[PDB]
């Protein structure tokens, strides 16, 4: 994944909504690894008036994670994701990824992401990305999991 070909699953112990809900508006409802507040974790986070990301901190808007491409209700989202990197230029290029939602009889859902294009360009980028995103991307992604599957079907 990641270079060859960019493909994530998810499975959701929960409904469509709590799914969506969790991840453009509950923000600091999370734990992972946002043990913080205001520089990461604000009472916002995801944009959904233009389509955008941004944090807000007693300074201003701090930290974003990307853009966002279309909003086609919670059931299509695109998205692109920006990379890491201390003494580089801005990287004005940027990976483009298709989330799809999958409903499972209401009471479950499934979440893919499909991809080929900036997928297939990583090799050095991906050392490059992964010294900073890969040391949390992975691991909220298998957390959010449990948390959404403890909020609904273990609790």
Same mark, same amino acid.
């Given at each position: 994944?990641?270079?060859?070909?960019?493909?994530?699953?998810?499975?959701?112990?929960?409904d469509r909504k709590t799914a969506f809900k969790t991840? &453009? +508006?509950?923000?600091?409802?999370?734990?992972?690894?946002?043990? $913080?507040?205001?520089?990461? *974790?604000?009472? &916002?986070?995801?944009?959904?008036?233009?389509?955008?990301?941004?944090?807000?901190? +007693? #300074? *201003?808007? +701090?930290?974003?994670?990307? !853009?966002?491409?279309?909003?086609?209700?919670?059931?299509?989202?695109?998205? *692109?994701?920006? &990379?890491? *990197?201390?003494? $580089?230029?801005?990287?004005?290029?940027?990976?483009?990824?298709?989330?799809?939602?999958?409903?499972?009889? #209401?009471?479950?859902? $499934?979440?893919?992401?499909?991809?080929?294009?900036?997928? $297939?360009?990583?090799?050095?980028?991906?050392?490059?990305?992964?010294?900073?995103?890969?040391?949390?991307?992975?691991?909220? !992604? #298998?957390?959010? #999991?449990?948390?959404?599957?403890?909020?609904?079907?273990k609790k």
């Amino acid at each position: 994944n990641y270079d060859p070909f960019v493909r994530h699953s998810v499975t959701v112990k929960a409904d469509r909504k709590t799914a969506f809900k969790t991840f &453009l +508006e509950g923000f600091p409802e999370w734990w992972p690894n946002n043990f $913080r507040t205001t520089k990461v *974790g604000a009472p &916002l986070g995801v944009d959904k008036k233009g389509g955008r990301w941004y944090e807000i901190d +007693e #300074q *201003g808007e +701090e930290h974003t994670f990307g !853009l966002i491409r279309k909003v086609d209700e919670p059931d299509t989202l695109v998205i *692109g994701w920006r &990379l890491n *990197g201390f003494g $580089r230029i801005d990287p004005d290029n940027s990976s483009e990824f298709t989330v799809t939602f999958v409903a499972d009889g #209401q009471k479950k859902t $499934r979440v893919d992401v499909e991809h080929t294009h900036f997928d $297939r360009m990583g090799t050095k980028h991906a050392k490059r990305v992964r010294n900073g995103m890969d040391k949390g991307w992975p691991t909220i !992604l #298998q957390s959010f #999991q449990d948390k959404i599957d403890e909020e609904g079907a273990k609790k």
